[PDB]
Design a protein around this ligand. Structure first.
Ligand SMILES: C[C@H](CCC(=O)N(CCCNC(=O)[C@H](O)[C@@H](O)[C@H](O)[C@H](O)CO)CCCNC(=O)[C@H](O)[C@@H](O)[C@H](O)[C@H](O)CO)[C@H]1CC[C@H]2[C@@H]3CC[C@@H]4C[C@H](O)CC[C@]4(C)[C@H]3C[C@H](O)[C@]12C
Ligand SMILES: C[C@H](CCC(=O)N(CCCNC(=O)[C@H](O)[C@@H](O)[C@H](O)[C@H](O)CO)CCCNC(=O)[C@H](O)[C@@H](O)[C@H](O)[C@H](O)CO)[C@H]1CC[C@H]2[C@@H]3CC[C@@H]4C[C@H](O)CC[C@]4(C)[C@H]3C[C@H](O)[C@]12C
Ligand SMILES: [Cl-]
Ligand SMILES: [Cl-]
Ligand SMILES: [Zn+2]
Ligand SMILES: [Zn+2]
Ligand SMILES: [Zn+2]
Ligand SMILES: [Zn+2]
Ligand SMILES: [Zn+2]
Ligand SMILES: [Zn+2]
Ligand SMILES: [Zn+2]
Ligand SMILES: [Zn+2]
Lengths: 127, 136, 127, 136
């Protein structure tokens, strides 16, 4: 019987399974990285570092919490991020709804913190 | 030790290597399937959000150049611009349109999430963007 | 008795009264001219030539009837008057209320015409 | 015709001139008072509108650089700009302020009407404009 051939076939099987695993790991890491980038870098208010609460979008296309941008605007009428003079504000149902859905998949600590801020800021639109 | 015993130990030694390799193989498969599940769960989350929160109600596609109206509703720039050739009112709430604002956060979130989905999904979006920018 | 002096005093009295009258006439004409200028040149919509109905003011500071500017905007997104790209609209309670008060002092023909257009355009804000 | 008769006709001729002049004088006064009434009626109309429709609720003056908010309420530019240093909400309806738009029609109407009022009223406005533009 070819004992050497049995070992070589088991070794290739193992090598194949390892590369499959390493690929799946890189794919997993890439997706999570991208998800976290969205959470941390797109959906967090630059003024308060929280996920937007009652998101408002300015004429310059940047978004902020309603509470945050109003406090800012009492002192300065330039977008915090791009410094263009602020000419319009609008609330964004889609951003609020997207954020609620995303946050719903996070830890109950994160979820409860968000609830506390919402009530603390009297953020009515998030019923 | 005599051939029957020497044969038996050589068999045990060979089998121990095979079994060590099968244990590694099995464990590697389990780690692979775990990361596959972890990946799929995040992909499921992205699909849920994209399909149920980030689709334009007019075209049913993920927003392409998302714009937000004064009434807080959002649409593709193309779709609302076509709508406004006939009615200056929100397709959803029918309030008079007073302002239209591009939303970078919506666009970046969509672009970043879609980048993780299949080639078929990514390509459709690229085609749709090209179609909408094309001259007519 | 000085008959010549009686005639001269009556003549001066008359001359004084005539100049007073001519001054009052010029003042009267000036005020009316200004009132009509406001009515005809400030409070009339350039698109429909009616006193504004449901006045809307654009980012460029020009005002139009709501109905008129919406029809315009289906075809062009430039202010009719200054041709700047339209970026915002807002209704104006003060303009509507001012116009109602002014029109209230005009003929019942003008008042009834305005009522007809309001209902014809379904101009809700003017209850 | 004899002196009594010649005297009498000379008296009648003199009196006829005086009476013709008094008739003219009386008629001229009536035309003057009529135009005075016509003028005052238009001035009353302007005052009614200015006082009851074109005053800023914050300062009680006729609007100086009128601005209109998204909620359709108007204020002086100076007054709303000062208010917004403390609250980003309409002083009248308390809605969140989303836009602030200068209104040429309001400004031109005020300027044109005020130009017909007393020197005292016109001067106060000029002073107030100067005060608000002054550095501080
Ligand atoms: C969209 C319409 C076809 C479908 C249709 O024929 N109806 C609408 C059905 C709804 N579905 C969609 O629109 C789809 O999402 C598409 O946009 C789809 O995404 C495309 O494949 C992508 O490009 C029905 C016709 C009536 N339309 C209405 O939308 C209803 O009246 C309704 O909304 C009510 O007004 C409202 O709900 C109140 O109850 C077609 C038919 C005629 C087209 C206009 C021709 C003249 C002008 C040419 C200019 O160069 C562009 C502007 C345009 C005004 C045109 C716009 C648009 O192109 C029209 C309306
Ligand atoms: C207006 C206030 C004095 C009168 C006052 O002391 N109160 C308001 C009374 C209302 N009357 C008026 O404002 C008048 O119309 C004046 O504006 C008048 O026209 C001037 O003579 C013309 O220049 C009471 C204090 C509380 N203020 C309120 O307005 C109430 O809280 C009320 O509105 C409620 O918030 C609301 O109704 C909710 O119920 C004074 C007192 C302290 C001042 C701030 C100091 C610090 C900052 C300096 C900056 O360089 C400019 C910004 C500023 C935030 C200042 C703004 C303003 O200058 C203030 C508020
Ligand atoms: Cl700027
Ligand atoms: Cl422009
Ligand atoms: Zn914030
Ligand atoms: Zn910005
Ligand atoms: Zn769309
Ligand atoms: Zn809407
Ligand atoms: Zn009009
Ligand atoms: Zn204009
Ligand atoms: Zn004021
Ligand atoms: Zn208001």
């Amino acid at each position: 019987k070819d004992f050497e051939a049995i070992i070589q076939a088991k070794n290739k099987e193992l090598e194949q399974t390892k590369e499959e695993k390493e690929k799946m790991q890189a794919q997993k890491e890439e997706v999570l990285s991208h998800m976290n980038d969205v959470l941390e870098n797109e959906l967090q208010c630059i003024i308060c570092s929280e996920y937007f609460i009652e998101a408002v979008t300015l004429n310059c296309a940047h978004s902020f919490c309603s509470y945050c941008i109003n406090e800012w605007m009492k002192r300065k009428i330039e977008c915090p991020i791009c410094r263009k003079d602020i000419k319009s504000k609008t609330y964004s149902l889609v951003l609020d709804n997207c954020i609620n859905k995303m946050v719903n998949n996070l830890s109950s600590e994160v979820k409860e913190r968000r609830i506390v801020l919402i009530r603390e800021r009297k953020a009515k639109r998030l019923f």
